[PDB]
Amino acid sequence: ISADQVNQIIYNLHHDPFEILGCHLLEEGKNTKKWVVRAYLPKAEAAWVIRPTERKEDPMNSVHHPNFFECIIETPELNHYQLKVKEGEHEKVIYDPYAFSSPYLTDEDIYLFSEGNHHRIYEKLGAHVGEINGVKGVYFAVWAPNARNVSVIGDFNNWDGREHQMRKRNYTIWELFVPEIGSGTVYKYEIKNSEGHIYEKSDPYGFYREVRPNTASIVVDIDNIYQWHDEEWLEKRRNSDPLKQPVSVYEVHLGSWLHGSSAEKMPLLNGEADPVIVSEWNPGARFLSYYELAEKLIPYVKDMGYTHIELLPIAEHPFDGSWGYQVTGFYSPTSRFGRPEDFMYFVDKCHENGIGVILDWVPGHFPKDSHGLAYFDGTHLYEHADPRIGEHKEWGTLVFNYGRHEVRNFLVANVLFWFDKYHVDGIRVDAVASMLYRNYLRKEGEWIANEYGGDEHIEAVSFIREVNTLLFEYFPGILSIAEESTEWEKVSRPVYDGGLGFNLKWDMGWMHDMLDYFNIDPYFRQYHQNNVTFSMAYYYNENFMLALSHDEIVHGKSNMLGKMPGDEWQKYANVRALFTYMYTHPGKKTMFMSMEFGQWSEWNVWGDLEWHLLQYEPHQQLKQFFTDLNALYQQEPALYTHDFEYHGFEWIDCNDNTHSVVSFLRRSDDPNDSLVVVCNFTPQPHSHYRIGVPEAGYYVELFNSDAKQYGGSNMGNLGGKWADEWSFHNKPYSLDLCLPPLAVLILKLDPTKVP
Ligand SMILES: [Mg+2]
Ligand SMILES: [Mg+2]
Ligand SMILES: [Mg+2]
Ligand SMILES: [Mg+2]
Say if CB 516 and CB 531 are below 8 A apart: yes
Cis amide linkage into residue 740, ω under 30° from 0? no
Amino acid at 117: N
From ligand 3's centre to the CA of 533, what distance in Å? Answer: 11
Question: Per the annotation, does 608 bind a ligand?
Answer: yes
From ligand 2's centre to the CA of 430, what distance in Å? Answer: 7
Say if CB 148 and CB 190 are below 8 A apart: no
Which numbered ligand comes closest to the C-alpha of 531?
A: 3
Residues comprising the chain, all counted? 755
Any bridge partners for residue 664, and if so which?
651, 677
> What structural domains and CATH numbers belong to the chain?
1-99 (no CATH), 100-220 (2.60.40.10), 221-642 (3.20.20.80), 643-751 (2.60.40.1180)
Considering only CA atoms, which of 667, 676, 663, 616 is closest in space to residue 639? 667
Which numbered ligand comes closest to the C-alpha of 432?
A: 2
Amino acid at 487: E
From ligand 3's centre to the CA of 540, what distance in Å? Answer: 21
Beta-strand pair 167-169/126-132:
unpaired
CA distances from 518 to 515, 584, 629, 711, 740 (A): 5, 17, 20, 18, 17
Between the CA atoms of 556, 559, 562 and 568, what dihedral angle is there, to the nearest 10 degrees? -160
From ligand 3's centre to the CA of 245, what distance in Å? Answer: 33
Say if CB 20 and CB 11 are below 8 A apart: no
- Radius of gyration (Cα) for the chain, nearest Å? 28
Q: If DSSP codes are grouped into helix, strand and coil, which group holds residue 397? A: strand
Which numbered ligand comes closest to the C-alpha of 482?
A: 2
| Cα gap 638→643, rounded to integer Å | 8
Which numbered ligand comes closest to the C-alpha of 509?
A: 3
Q: If DSSP codes are grouped into helix, strand and coil, which group holds residue 498? A: coil
Considering only CA atoms, which of 412, 511, 514 is closest in space to residue 468? 412
| Cα gap 609→77, rounded to integer Å | 53
Considering only CA atoms, which of 246, 330, 348, 220 is closest in space to residue 293? 348
Between the CA atoms of 292, 295, 300 and 306, what dihedral angle is there, to the nearest 10 degrees? 100
Torsional class of 193: left (φ above 0), alpha (ψ -120 to 50), beta (otherwise): beta
| Cα gap 125→79, rounded to integer Å | 17
Between the CA atoms of 334, 337, 340 and 344, what dihedral angle is there, to the nearest 10 degrees? -120
Which numbered ligand comes closest to the C-alpha of 258?
A: 4
| Cα gap 752→749, rounded to integer Å | 9
Torsional class of 711: left (φ above 0), alpha (ψ -120 to 50), beta (otherwise): left
Residue 415, CB half-sphere, CA atoms under 13 Å: how many?
A: 30
Considering only CA atoms, which of 389, 533, 525 is closest in space to residue 455? 389
From ligand 1's centre to the CA of 191, what distance in Å? Answer: 11
Burial class (CB in 10 A: 0-12, 13-18, 19+), 345: buried
179 phi/psi in degrees, rounded to 5: -70, 155
- Please, what is the end-to-end C-alpha distance for the chain in angstroms? 74
From ligand 2's centre to the CA of 322, what distance in Å? Answer: 13
From ligand 3's centre to the CA of 331, what distance in Å? Answer: 44
From ligand 2's centre to the CA of 334, what distance in Å? Answer: 23
Beta-strand pair 198-201/186-192:
antiparallel
From ligand 3's centre to the CA of 380, what distance in Å? Answer: 46
Experimental method: X-ray
User: What is the sign, positive or negative, of the torsion defined by CA atoms of 646, 649, 652, 658?
Assistant: negative
Q: Which residues contact 168 (CB under 8 A, 6 or more apart)?
A: 150, 174
Q: If DSSP codes are grouped into helix, strand and coil, which group holds residue 423? A: coil
CA distances from 190 to 148, 154, 206, 209, 368 (A): 11, 10, 15, 16, 18
From ligand 2's centre to the CA of 242, what distance in Å? Answer: 25
Residue 479, CB half-sphere, CA atoms under 13 Å: how many?
A: 34
Burial class (CB in 10 A: 0-12, 13-18, 19+), 213: exposed
| Cα gap 572→475, rounded to integer Å | 41
Residue 546: in which H helix or E strand, if any? strand 544-548
Say if CB 93 and CB 51 are below 8 A apart: no
DSSP conformational letter for 322: G
Which numbered ligand comes closest to the C-alpha of 550?
A: 2
Say if CB 104 and CB 176 are below 8 A apart: no
| Cα gap 638→650, rounded to integer Å | 12
Residues labelled catalytic? 430, 483
| Cα gap 558→621, rounded to integer Å | 21
Question: What does the buried/exposed string (b/e) look like for 258-294 if buried means 16 or more CB atoms within 10 Å of the residue's CB?
Answer: bbbebeeebbbbeeeeebbbbeeeeeebbbbbbbbbb
Say if CB 625 and CB 710 are below 8 A apart: yes
Residue 223, CB half-sphere, CA atoms under 13 Å: how many?
A: 11
Q: Give helix 405-422 / helix 458-474 axis angle, nearest 10°.
A: 30
E-state strands within 124-240: 126-132, 135-143, 149-154, 167-169, 173-179, 186-192, 198-201, 217-218
From ligand 3's centre to the CA of 528, what distance in Å? Answer: 6
Give the per-residue SS3 of 639-679: HCCCCCCHHHEEEEECCCCCCCEEEEEECCCCHHHCEEEEE
